[PDB]
Design a protein around this ligand. Structure first.
Ligand SMILES: [Mg+2]
Ligand SMILES: [Mg+2]
Length: 828
DNA sequence: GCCGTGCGCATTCGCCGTGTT
DNA sequence: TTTACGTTGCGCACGGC
RNA sequence: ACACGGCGAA
């Protein structure tokens, strides 16, 4: 903790926590590096052990160093073969069919995809591959033109959507069948390929230096191999599989080096900037209140919940797990193919959803028994707080259920009450006033005690929404029964804001209309903006049901389209995403994809949607009802969004003198400071090396031709589409930080379970976390005009030169912010 | 400079393992 | 060396009036 | 900075 104690790690740790743990920490931090390095190797090996080195980061810096030098030979060759007054070296014509440097990549990316694939490879081998590779790309690739504007025809849906070595060529080979423009292709036989490759390989040794020698055999040079290899070693040690700490995290006292104690070559950064320049920007920023939050949060002690671990260890192995959606051990034995071949899709998810489950579970068992564990914390560039280790209090239900707070306290009267509210919430009974939630729990007393007594026999808990967190609650609840209000409880009891995006919008705009929808006002009943939008959608569907157009040709009209959804079960869930993203910039076309993928696509997979006859239409239709319904509800917000977008737009713009063509104001990055003093710099940038996508072999970049470069170029588009969510998210993250500091400094709360818009503590402190999250909400927006502050941030610094078509600050509303203090259902 | 025919882009952020049968 | 189909609407770009 | 599957999240 001492600014001086930021010396030799082991000494400071032991001095504070004893040599034993001091060792465990460092041993642990070191293991994370080791594990990370392994994970890299395994991959980097399976990469070359399957001819695909060029892809790996390790070879990228080599490729870029040579890829360009090829034209300095390839083309330097053509404009030289043209000097000969006779026949052309055969290769000439059999390489002019595609982009030069595109060949060079297909060349190198293949000369190595063999020099690292097999152990005994010669010129015939390479050439028979290079030339072989020059084709395909020459074939299915020369279709770049005389097909453009029609290639992106999405007739291939994300073209080679399903990745695959030969797959990209499989589900795209007989697809070549279609006559389309012209047609027919005279295969390069099987005697030109070698020749094609031979010159490639020769003008490779002629340009680069890779392929060296003393029929012969090809071998990667000594310095170009020891390079990719060095690059690896010097790359495997930077993606550690960070793990929790067995001692409190190293407090942050600067933009880097907090969290973990071992002082390494690559310490941890406070903000997750992509560029050192971004990070370096915080290098001197005064933000005491921000460091305070991150430190307070990360000093929260957690322990593994031995009982939840107990059931989770076994039950996740059960052939048929009683837990709703837990990835099962094995597959589903062969997918007719028909529409029931989606398995390749569903099992893909399962196997990956399963990987993390076993990792989370292994971490839990690895850390059971420890008196406590901690999670270092840092932030993304908007300032939201994230635990650094893969396993953390912000994970899924099972993860959250495996974790509980280490420092509990006698639960008490209030603690018990909130514990019951939490349990009701974990069960899903949460869109109802508190009295009805308590009743839910009390009138389920025996069920809860049962699941507590014998979880693997009384699995009523697995049936709930947050089964493991609910089970976690049953144990604690059963505990209160066996011991009374004196029971020491440390269960993190979660309070979550209801649609915080809109809440923040309503607060900063004082919008009472919106506020009401998102419980920013005291109310007997619990407002649910998604359910609201859902009702409106139903009035529509109901209306379109009896009288709303019919089918033409084949295209399902309304009425029949509405009936389908009516047949379904349009609920708050279907409208969620869209209501939440609207004010972020999600348009009707967004909704379509959302409804499609979020509720239709999946419903179909399990077979509970055998009444949609083409997800589309069903989706576009739903997307429209939601838009027209969500629009008549979220307005101030949309106004506020558009105001932000205008700001981003005018700052991203590049202003040129109407007459001289001179740049008057260079594109600018949107910048703002959150209420707790966290500065955010939004500056997306259009890629530097305009990459060329060569189907099959993959994609690669290249140093620009035009000497532009300079900074990198701001992405005016991204800058405008992100400003709304980035702004609001930084606003919630600030509220999160302010609440952590407030609850700690005003109520002495030490334990926090923070999940962005979710605030948690032990039952005994629940009541105070409850007022605190509300108090900070009010102090903030009653003390700051974030939009007007934002404006004072760009109005001057970067602007004018004609730019003054800046819409006016949205009109404030009549929402009395202090009412939030008396709102039962606001939570956040 | 001022309105058509075209093209591009769908909200944003975190992070991981696989690249097949 | 045997899963994979598919639409719907605002600014930014030329650029001939 | 482009890919697929996941999850977290607004
Ligand atoms: Mg929420
Ligand atoms: Mg969420």
């Amino acid at each position: 903790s001492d600014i001086e104690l930021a010396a030799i790690p082991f000494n400071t740790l032991a001095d504070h926590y004893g040599e034993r743990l001091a060792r465990e920490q460092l041993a642990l931090e070191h293991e994370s590096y080791e594990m990370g390095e392994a994970r890299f190797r395994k991959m980097f090996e399976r990469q070359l052990k399957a001819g695909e080195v060029a892809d790996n980061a390790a070879a990228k810096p080599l490729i870029t160093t040579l890829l360009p030098k090829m034209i300095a030979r390839i083309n330097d060759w053509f404009e030289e073969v043209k000097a000969k007054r006779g026949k052309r070296p055969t290769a000439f014509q059999f390489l002019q069919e595609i982009k030069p440097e595109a060949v060079a990549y297909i060349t190198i990316k293949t000369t190595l995809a063999c020099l690292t694939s097999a152990d005994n490879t010669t010129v015939q081998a390479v050439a028979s591959a290079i030339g072989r590779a020059i084709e395909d790309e020459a074939r299915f690739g020369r279709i770049r033109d005389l097909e453009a504007k029609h290639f992106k025809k999405n007739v291939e849906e994300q073209l080679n959507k399903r990745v695959g070595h030969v797959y990209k060529k499989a589900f795209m080979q007989v697809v070549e069948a279609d006559m389309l423009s012209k047609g027919a292709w005279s295969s390069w036989h099987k005697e030109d390929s070698i020749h094609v490759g031979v010159r490639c390989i020769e003008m490779l040794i002629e340009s680069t230096g890779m392929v060296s020698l003393h029929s012969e055999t090809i071998e990667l040079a000594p310095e170009y191999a020891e390079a990719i290899a060095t690059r690896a070693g010097a790359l495997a040690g930077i993606s550690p599989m960070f793990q929790p700490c067995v001692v409190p995290p190293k407090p942050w006292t600067g933009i880097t080096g907090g969290g973990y104690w071992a002082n390494g070559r690559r310490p941890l950064a406070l903000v997750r900037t992509h560029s050192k320049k971004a990070l370096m920007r915080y290098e001197d920023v005064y933000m005491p209140e921000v460091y305070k939050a991150i430190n307070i949060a990360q000093n929260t002690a957690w322990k593994i919940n031995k009982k939840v671990l107990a059931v989770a260890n076994v039950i996740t192995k059960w052939k048929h797990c009683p837990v709703e959606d837990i990835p099962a051990i094995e597959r589903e034995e062969l997918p007719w193919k028909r529409a029931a071949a989606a398995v390749y899709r569903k099992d893909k998810a399962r196997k990956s959803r399963r990987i993390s489950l076993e990792f989370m579970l292994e971490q839990a068992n690895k850390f059971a028994n420890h008196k406590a564990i901690w999670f270092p914390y840092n932030m993304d560039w908007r300032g939201r707080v994230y635990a650094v280790s893969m396993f953390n209090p912000q994970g899924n239900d099972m993860t959250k259920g495996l974790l509980t707070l280490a420092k509990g306290k006698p639960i008490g009267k209030e603690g018990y009450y909130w514990l019951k509210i939490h349990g009701a919430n974990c069960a899903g009974v949460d869109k109802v006033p508190f009295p009805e939630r308590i009743k839910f729990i009390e009138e389920n007393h025996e069920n809860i005690m049962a699941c507590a007594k014998s979880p693997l026999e009384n699995t009523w808990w697995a049936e709930q929404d947050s089964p493991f967190c609910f089970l976690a609650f049953c144990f604690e609840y059963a505990g209160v029964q066996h011991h009374g209000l004196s029971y020491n409880c440390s269960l993190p009891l979660a309070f979550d804001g209801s649609c915080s995006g809109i809440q923040h919008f309503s607060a900063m705009l004082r919008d009472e209309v919106g506020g009401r929808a998102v419980n920013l006002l005291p109310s007997e009943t619990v407002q649910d903006i998604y359910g609201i939008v859902a009702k409106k959608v139903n009035e529509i569907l109901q209306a379109d049901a009896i009288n709303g157009t019919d089918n033409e040709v084949v295209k399902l009209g309304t009425k029949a389209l509405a009936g389908q959804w009516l047949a379904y079960g349009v609920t708050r869930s279907v409208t969620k995403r869209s209501v939440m993203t609207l004010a972020y910039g999600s348009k009707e076309f967004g909704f379509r994809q959302q409804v499609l993928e979020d509720t239709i696509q999946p419903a179909i997979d399990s077979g509970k949607g055998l009444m949609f006859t083409q997800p589309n239409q069903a989706a576009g239709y739903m997307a429209k009802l939601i838009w027209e319904s969500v629009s008549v509800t979220v307005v101030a917000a949309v106004e506020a969004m558009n105001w932000l977008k205008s700001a981003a737009k005018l700052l991203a713009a590049e202003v040129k003198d109407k007459k001289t063509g001179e740049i008057l104001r260079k594109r600018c990055a949107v910048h703002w400071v959150t209420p707790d003093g966290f500065p955010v710099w939004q500056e997306y940038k259009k890629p530097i090396q305009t990459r060329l996508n060569l189907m099959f072999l993959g994609q690669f970049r290249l140093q620009p031709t035009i000497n532009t470069n300079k900074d990198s170029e701001i992405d005016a588009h991204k800058q405008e589409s992100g400003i709304a969510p980035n702004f609001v998210h930084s606003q919630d993250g600030s509220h999160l930080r302010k609440t952590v500091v407030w609850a700690h400094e005003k109520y002495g709360i030490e334990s926090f379970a923070l999940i962005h818009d979710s605030f948690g503590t032990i039952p005994a402190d629940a009541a105070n976390l409850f007022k605190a999250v509300r108090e900070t909400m009010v102090d903030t927006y009653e003390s700051c005009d974030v939009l007007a502050d934002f404006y004072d941030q760009f109005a001057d610094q970067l602007h004018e030169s004609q730019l003054d078509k800046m819409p006016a600050l949205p009109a404030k509303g009549n929402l009395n912010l202090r009412d939030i203090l008396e709102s039962d259902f606001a939570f956040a």
